[PDB]
Scaffold this active site. Structure first.
Site, PDB file in Angstrom:
ATOM      1  N   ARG D  55       3.617   7.737 -23.119  1.00 56.41           N
ATOM      2  CA  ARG D  55       4.722   8.658 -23.439  1.00 56.41           C
ATOM      3  C   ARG D  55       4.968   8.665 -24.961  1.00 56.41           C
ATOM      4  O   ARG D  55       5.392   9.639 -25.569  1.00 56.41           O
ATOM      5  CB  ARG D  55       6.017   8.320 -22.671  1.00 56.41           C
ATOM      6  N   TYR D 108      13.912  33.582 -33.258  1.00 53.42           N
ATOM      7  CA  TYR D 108      13.235  33.794 -31.954  1.00 53.42           C
ATOM      8  C   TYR D 108      14.267  33.804 -30.819  1.00 53.42           C
ATOM      9  O   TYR D 108      15.153  32.946 -30.736  1.00 53.42           O
ATOM     10  CB  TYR D 108      12.269  32.669 -31.753  1.00 53.42           C
ATOM     11  N   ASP D 182      12.085  27.238 -38.430  1.00 60.45           N
ATOM     12  CA  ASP D 182      10.970  27.638 -37.571  1.00 60.45           C
ATOM     13  C   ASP D 182       9.931  28.318 -38.453  1.00 60.45           C
ATOM     14  O   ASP D 182      10.066  29.490 -38.820  1.00 60.45           O
ATOM     15  CB  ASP D 182      11.410  28.565 -36.419  1.00 60.45           C
ATOM     16  N   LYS D 207       0.702  29.046 -31.570  1.00 56.03           N
ATOM     17  CA  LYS D 207       0.324  30.299 -32.269  1.00 56.03           C
ATOM     18  C   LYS D 207      -0.848  29.978 -33.186  1.00 56.03           C
ATOM     19  O   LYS D 207      -1.986  29.649 -32.700  1.00 56.03           O
ATOM     20  CB  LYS D 207       1.618  30.978 -32.815  1.00 56.03           C
TER      21      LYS D 207
END
Lengths: 391, 391, 392, 392
Positions: D55, D108, D182, D207
């Site tokens: 993890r 966004y 962002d 992206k």
């Protein structure tokens, strides 16, 4: 149109199923919903219907269609690596009593397959100088079944005059299978099938994958030869895994942008090396004066980034280690066609050992460079610090 | 100890690097940090040092070590599927003028390779009845180089008397390479190398992978034969991808628990079928009265879940479709050794076509079942509804 | 409806397998719409199994989701990047400032830490209950209790809840509570949580469902009541799992029956031998009589897995701990569990006391947690016996 | 320090490559400790690149993290299952009940929805600012403002912030604000956010970094100030990404330079042609003079990507929308972007107005968002021209 073709090759909806890329369909067993369906699949088992994972799944079929579109083929046969593609494409067309004629600059494992495997099976091999052109007719025998080209040559980079060779071969042994190891060109910078070659073979391992992380061989065939290559390689169990097929399809997408950078960088390095006090000769097909450069200029639509050059000096072991051990950006490894730049040395006696029925014409240590995607001036800086270690 | 061995086979720290499973090291290029390192890797290129991805990465080396531990071998050679392992292991040891002797119950693609590929290379093949035992000496020739076994047989499930065959072969042609397709036993239920067989070949595709989603062939060799098989298959470019090697290693982990369920279920189905009004014969090596069952009981340590049975009736096309098209739980597909149960029909004339130099002894439709991990009583229920469709 | 047949078939609809036995692997962010009409239909059905955008899933995720709904009897299955994310995000999806969360004090430590370190600063309080509280859970319910979070068996100490008693008692006082369970030990399948009136069944699919210790993923299977809210609020937090992990989780299901039966048979044989051993104080195995909540396990579960613990007669000092743990041949030290190999970990009583809030521990020797894998059981017992001889 | 050489080498330390060119793929939950001493050392260093538990990451994650720190100049890189998770969880990591979040109204949409639908019920308020507010951002700052969230260029409409002006103004009033950006459009690399005094640079690595539209993953590269809190609070929410996706993201970096140069060159050529076209009202491309914030792009970025928008002179009705979008040959309709292929989407002015809170839109024609991929630019222009002829 090559850039648009690369982006779209193989990406039919029946393979992408709503996604941009082809699905990854991992399978051995493929399920038949009825006896009728199984009869249909069976009839179409080599015609792109789901039958058994050894023949392919939707993922393989997608790559196959892409390779046929790119290289102008009737079919594409898949293998676990380039050496498998070479050995098995040759095997697919030979029989006891045949002759194979292979360029003496062929990839060493290609030569080894012929000298060590075919020889025991009643098949003899001989060799030719890569610059022989139409004079290849002197090497042709009534039993010549395969003429095997590789342009540019491994390591030393000699470009054939493929038109001349093909017309000569067709004039004397029209039944011969003409094959080329077209890896340097990534199948797209030299359209081998358009020049009358029967089979275009690649180590897809190199530029098609592009990242040094998957191994795969491809053989794109004309209509004349596809059925025999496909069925006979199938009988040898040749295939590649679905995931690797997917990653190959995926490499194609960036192949144009990568190969333009490899060309631009590698030629600027070749030009700089050609003018360097410590360099005897540069072997790069795109560089004027290189062996067969004229054929490169006439017959290819670009260059990749693999080439070699010869030092003025034949380095001793001490010098070899000082040179190669202290690079900052170049790495020593086999293969090429990746994103990172590589360097290998080859002494003249090593190369002389793998040019059968030919002769070497240099005396200094030969350096083969793969020029990757790093800043070219950083690479040049690394090579110049290299020269300073051996002056 | 087989369960503990399966859990731990190949999981040395140099391959797992802090994880439970081996790392997945994807590579063609493997980097040499110095000229000295490259000389060391080169010397050890077939001895488990990183050299080039065609020879393996840490992932392959892990699988290799696991397969050698499990099957008691000197080395393990890897291939892209079982058919590749068969074709290339045979090729690795033959030369023009050799004879191959193969059981007539060999896997059909194995036979095809010999009849269609070896024949053109000056190698002749002949065949034997799987129950021949010591009488195999009648088929041996001074030029017999390979004796190829498969026990139990494909489809019809006949078990050889391997001790008898091996002693006979060693007495007459001690130079012969004795090979076995040991896929049914997943290499672990029959310890072929301990019985004097030189090469144990598997479609790792089947039980080792266990989930019908990767294809891979393996050939575990004794010390006598390892070097030749390894080097000659390398010359044909044989390898498997890293991810597939990892998934194979991973299948081994559950192989004991899977194979115990396959044995328990498949034998209960075989017993129920044997007592069914509509069944003529059951072919399951673990079932008393099956061909070579005594050899199974003496020489194997378990069963897998693949077997066949013969219907009293030879089904016509209408009946075949009514039977096979309406199963709820069984699926029609090729391959086997997965978690799901499969069904195929084979008419007597189909089987007669692939038993060279032999004779069929049944007349009804033959059904081959792969018994997977589903509830056995649910599977039995599915087969009984099947019988009701064709009574 | 037999578990083994269900495990083999769950999720393997033709629309996801497309000719193969397993689901396809569809890697994607972008999912293409062929027309404005198609885009409009995909938009409407973006939470209903139509391809819309990779954050919502591909065919591969839809396959796993269907399989998990089938196996645990849910209306939907929400996916997460690991078990801890499933826990944290499933609780978050249902709370707001001013709420209280009531959690078993046997809850996985990371679940406790999420409540105490994250939820606290968002105006949400947490309190804790002893796992054997049963009907007396009413004593801990507040007017603002929104969630009652169960875990059975308990982490490390393995106490089994009386779930029927707890659930009837909560509903009698706070009927509209969201009751959740961390059902990892039962792999969702040995304890059918949703049939007991639990709203959300959470797993670390990381453990038994994957089964090979090589992928991480969390699942939350929800009843019809709670599915939309969990799904949509988890989505707003960006929760998803990669298509390849989804595929490997579906693939794990196929052998989950044969694996769980071996883990049960082996771990019970080990537990029985440990109970008899003179260096052992107590064995905490749900399937072993005398363990806390055994009779509830007997009644409520259809099987056991392979994880349990035992308490040594000694509290090991540091030199004995090392000598014990460092020299095992088959057991390995590592966190996680539910794989094919056997693991061992030690916990001192004072370490466990620190993660047992609002409650006391019941032992004073060193506690050893065992995961019994697929190795030969007699080999494992021999390794444990060699271990005992190192700390006599 | 040349970007291209950095991209090729970033993260490829010998300890992660182990003889290969790329990092190994280490799949794991369990990570084995050979001794109590080793376990103790791994525990101490569990957030410092020692193997501890899957993890927290394996060697594969550590490689990507190092690469991202190198490329964006950060002290650490936190990983998430997609870009939306990175946004949501990076904001959550720093807030508590009573805080206010100040976000660009060009953010966004999923980032806006997280604030308005999740954060609101946790006692955290959100307000919004026009992306060209600059130094006047001071007008929107409150005593309880904890986060100022930037996105430049803006989603869909592509407005570029004056980041230097915004950041100096925030620090002059609320010096201890966490400023996040962002930075997906610049791929972390065409705008060096951390050099501008931003604390956290977030991407949808989905992206450009992945570059092939086949993996989802979020990253948050943090300065030394903010790394521990983001890392630890994200961890408590279970945030991680799978090792295979981490490997594919590292692998995407290698071609990111050659890809971004093609996306810039092609998208600018398309933009220039669109500006001249009689059916086009306006072009929104950061690199095209006249676009909102172009001069800030000129000053502050070292390049462009391939995503931009343009506004048609017409507001298309439904039949014209269909006829336009449905018949393209090379452009495809799909969400996401940053891959090798070209995409097209339409947004009506009323749709964009609805996701522009506390601000007004500046156009009235149909807006078309283009992602220009790697296809021949003249082929793409021919497909767009055929599109224009369908709505004359």
């Amino acid at each position: 149109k090559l850039d648009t073709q690369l982006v779209n090759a193989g990406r039919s909806k029946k393979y992408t199923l709503g996604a941009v890329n082809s699905v990854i369909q991992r399978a051995s067993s493929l399920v038949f919903d009825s006896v009728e369906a199984k009869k249909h699949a069976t009839r179409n088992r080599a015609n792109g219907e789901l039958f058994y994972g050894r023949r392919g799944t939707l993922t393989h079929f997608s790559l196959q269609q892409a390779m046929c579109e790119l290289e102008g083929g009737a079919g594409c046969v898949l293998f676990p690596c380039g050496a498998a593609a070479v050995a098995n494409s040759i095997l697919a067309f030979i029989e006891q009593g045949d002759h194979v004629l292979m360029t003496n600059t062929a990839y060493e494992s290609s030569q080894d397959f012929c000298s060590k495997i075919l020889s025991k099976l009643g098949v003899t091999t001989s060799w030719f100088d890569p610059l022989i052109g139409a004079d290849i007719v002197k090497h042709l025998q009534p039993n010549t079944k395969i003429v095997f080209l590789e342009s540019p040559g491994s390591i030393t980079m000699e470009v054939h005059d493929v038109p001349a060779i093909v017309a000569a071969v067709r004039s004397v042994v029209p039944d011969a299978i003409i094959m080329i190891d077209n890896t340097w060109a990534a199948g797209v910078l030299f359209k081998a099938l358009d020049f009358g070659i029967d089979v275009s073979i690649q180590a897809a391992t190199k530029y098609l994958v592009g990242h040094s992380d998957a191994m795969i061989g491809t053989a794109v065939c004309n209509a004349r030869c596809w059925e025999q290559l496909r069925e006979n390689a199938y009988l040898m169990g040749q295939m590649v895994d679905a995931d690797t097929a997917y990653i190959t399809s995926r490499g194609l997408r960036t192949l144009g942008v990568r190969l333009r950078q490899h060309h631009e960088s590698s030629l600027k390095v070749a030009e700089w090396l050609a003018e360097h006090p410590q360099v005897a000769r540069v072997n790069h097909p795109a560089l004027p004066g290189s062996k067969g450069h004229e054929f490169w200029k006439r017959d290819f639509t670009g260059s990749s980034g693999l080439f070699s050059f010869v030092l003025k000096k034949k380095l001793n072991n001490e010098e070899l280690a000082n040179y190669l051990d202290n690079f900052s950006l170049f790495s020593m490894a086999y293969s090429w066609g990746g994103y990172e730049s590589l360097i290998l040395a080859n002494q003249p006696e090593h190369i002389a050992a793998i040019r059968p029925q030919g002769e070497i014409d240099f005396s200094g240590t030969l350096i083969r460079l793969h020029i990757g995607l790093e800043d070219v001036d950083d690479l040049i800086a690394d090579l110049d610090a290299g020269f300073a270690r051996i002056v």
